[PDB]
Write a protein that binds this DNA or RNA. Structure first.
Lengths: 275, 88
RNA sequence: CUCGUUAAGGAACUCGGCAAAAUGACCCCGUAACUUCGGGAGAAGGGGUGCUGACUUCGGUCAGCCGCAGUGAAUAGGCCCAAGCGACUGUUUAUCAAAAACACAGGUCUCUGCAAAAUCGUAAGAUGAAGUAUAGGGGCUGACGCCUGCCCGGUGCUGGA
RNA sequence: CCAUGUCCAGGUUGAAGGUGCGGUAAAACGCACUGGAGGACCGAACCCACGUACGUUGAAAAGUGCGGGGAUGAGGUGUGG
RNA sequence: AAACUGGGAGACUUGAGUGCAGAAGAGGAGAGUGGAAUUCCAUGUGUAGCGGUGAAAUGCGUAGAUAUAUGGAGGAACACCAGUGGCGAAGGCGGCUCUCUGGUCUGUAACUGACGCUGAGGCUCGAAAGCGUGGGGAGCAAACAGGAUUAGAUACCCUGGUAGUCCACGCCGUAAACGAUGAGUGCUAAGUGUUGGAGGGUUUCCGCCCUUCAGUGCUGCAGCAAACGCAUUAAGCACUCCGCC
């Protein structure tokens, strides 16, 4: 649930947080962590290519199985854990050979289930199958877009897609955001929707907590000088003395579309709905 | 709500002589079983306002019979309310 | 120039109580409007404080003594009633401007189906991200409370054929 | 901005949760004890630079004296980049 | 002094509850599901109108409307059954299946033995509109725009159209919330319909006659009323307690 703080300081008045009640341990598996660095938005060359990033808390990377390739061997669920790198929770899983792995935690996963990962698997939450073998109207997450590469699509906290129909060598899916699309019928996905979903309702509360997450502050274009922004300059507060407010590099900012007009995937997109 | 075998099961142990379905012991014990089960059902279905009426009327009936038993024999009253587990 | 004292008056001084003077420790009693119920609050306003003896249930209390003065030196909040601006802690013109300016948590519009959009670069290669729409970029507004009218002729943007 | 170290005398306050008692049909709830949150409070080192007097061929190419603000954080700062 | 009211020791079964055997029902909460129609979409055929009114106009249409045929998408309400019928303390409740659950009626005569009635203050529930957070959104429709009508028309009429009307969770606490008729109990002519039961006869009575409980309507006497009227479902004759003028 969402936890509400009492207003004991001015920096506390309207903050909320997670209860962390689906999490069952706080000590990760040692053989599945690697280091990370916090690039802070800088390049190959040492230059800022993305503004407003840098300098929070240190993190170790957990390796996830986005492929789901170990078939005809059940895996038991041992823990539901905290990941610093994503917004979903994560599950430690014991295969019977004794391989260990991490997995994205779907909605309603209990410690103790036994998941299966092939074409003859059942339709239960957690199970992963090729899209050919999934009926019409099942809620789905963690979708491959190329055979054998790993799920890419429905991965963040509380998201889901749905199966609409089949044809020759393609399956129709309605994704999160409402776009309709085609995906190869030999790709995989796992049954369920992603888990921790109150995540959306958290109120950060003060300027220090979003500094703990690795975000640096943002200055508005219109309190700059005319050599920094197209919006800078003028005596006093000023309006947008232009048509169409723009980015620091020109490029209009309300309603102007920026995807590639000769995209090699415009064959597969039915019914653009939201971007 | 209790079945008709639970009911006879619990009126065969608060009877006094044989053939003893009256006797405010029997009635408050059976009413206690009912009120417990209905409290469960209410916790599950908490916007069933039309069954809560019956719950409340059972509670009134039990409290009335308790008052009667007390005003006429305090020994039976104390022994009961110990045996049945109430009087908070 | 830096220090100490000053009769009677006590802001009559000056752009302005500037600068000085005054409050300052511990223990006890008490303490308003308003309020987001946490505060306001050290609100305000008052009292005690040394030394000897006796008892000390324990922590203290009684009897006595001395000085103008007992936290006897040094160190340590002045307070109150009203109005504007910014919610708040924070940041800023190294060296004439610390603020009503910037930021901020919260709001809203829009772009982006992943070799994502965006940015560095001739390119190779990179950040974004070992992320995947509850995510990432851009513009405006700026806690919280109540609210946010009319206009699509013009100009941009989107769709059309 | 990145990697790896290190620093913050002393004192105050009393959030969530927990345990016991009462109030109930079960409860909202009430009171003690516990507990130790926070861009919380007071105040040295440390980091700052609000007022004023002096200095202005200076003790000093930006300071000193007497007062001021922050002092567990959006903190200070050493070494290699 | 000891009839009555109060107190104490007993005893009883008619009030009140329980057991046993049966009956009816849009009573409530949750989860799925069906067909008819309106709207939009897709595709074929198809030529100049359609729509609307007391008459007109605005609107849609030769970027091929309306019509017509087949397929999809979504939402909301449930035709016939349907009835002065049923259920609920009231507000209210109508497609179908399952799960959880409250109350009523009838017969019996195992049981308890007055355990009853009413109820200031207090709690619970309470149509529609409205408010908050997050969804959904087909039809209808405050506000609003355009067309008419009139002396004028910030209306009635026509073409559009936003909140809302729908779901989950909180708040609000009011209506001609009405039978403008507080609750309990006993007593006082008859006649006639219908809903759910129980007994006796004739008995294929399971379709008929008689009796008897509990609901729901119509007519009508004593009595009551200022008249209207009410009348075993009292506004009649009486006792208890509350609310109010």
């Amino acid at each position: 649930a969402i936890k509400k703080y009492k207003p004991t300081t001015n920096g506390r008045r309207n903050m909320t947080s997670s209860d962390f009640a689906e999490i069952t341990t706080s000590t990760p598996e040692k053989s599945l962590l690697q280091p990370l660095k916090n690039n802070a938005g800088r390049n190959n060359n040492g230059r800022i290519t993305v503004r407003h990033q840098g300098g929070g808390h240190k993190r170790q990377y957990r390796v996830i199985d986005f492929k789901r390739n170990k078939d005809n061997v059940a895996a038991v669920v041992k823990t539901i854990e905290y990941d610093p790198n994503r917004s979903a929770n994560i599950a430690l899983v014991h295969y019977e050979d004794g391989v260990k792995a991490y997995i994205l935690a779907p909605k309603g996963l209990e410690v103790g289930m036994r998941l299966v990962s092939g074409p003859e698997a059942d339709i239960k939450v957690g199970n992963a199958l090729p899209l050919e073998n999934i009926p019409v109207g099942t809620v789905i997450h963690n979708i491959e877009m190329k055979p054998g590469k790993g799920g890419q699509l429905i991965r963040s906290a509380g998201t889901s897609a749905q199966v609409l129909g089949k044809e020759g060598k393609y399956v129709l899916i309605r994704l999160n955001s409402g776009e309709v699309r085609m995906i190869l019928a030999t790709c995989r996905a796992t049954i369920g929707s992603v888990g921790n979903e109150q995540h959306e309702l958290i109120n950060i509360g003060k300027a220090g907590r979003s500094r703990w997450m690795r975000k640096r502050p943002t200055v508005r274009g219109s309190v700059m000088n005319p050599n920094d922004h197209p919006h800078g300059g003028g005596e006093g507060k000023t309006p947008i003395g232009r048509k169409a407010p723009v980015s620091p590099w020109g490029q209009p900012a309300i309603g102007y579309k920026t995807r590639n007009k000769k995209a090699k995937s415009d064959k597969l997109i039915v019914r653009r709905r939201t971007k | 709500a209790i079945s008709q075998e639970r009911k006879n099961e619990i009126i065969k142990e608060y009877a006094r002589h044989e053939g003893d379905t009256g006797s405010p012991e029997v009635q408050i014990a059976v009413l206690t079983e009912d009120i417990n089960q209905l409290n469960e059902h209410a916790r599950t279905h908490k916007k069933d306002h039309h069954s809560y009426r019956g719950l409340m009327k059972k509670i009134g009936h039990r409290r009335n019979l308790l008052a009667y038993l007390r005003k006429t024999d305090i020994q039976r009253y104390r022994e009961l309310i110990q045996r049945l587990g109430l009087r908070r």
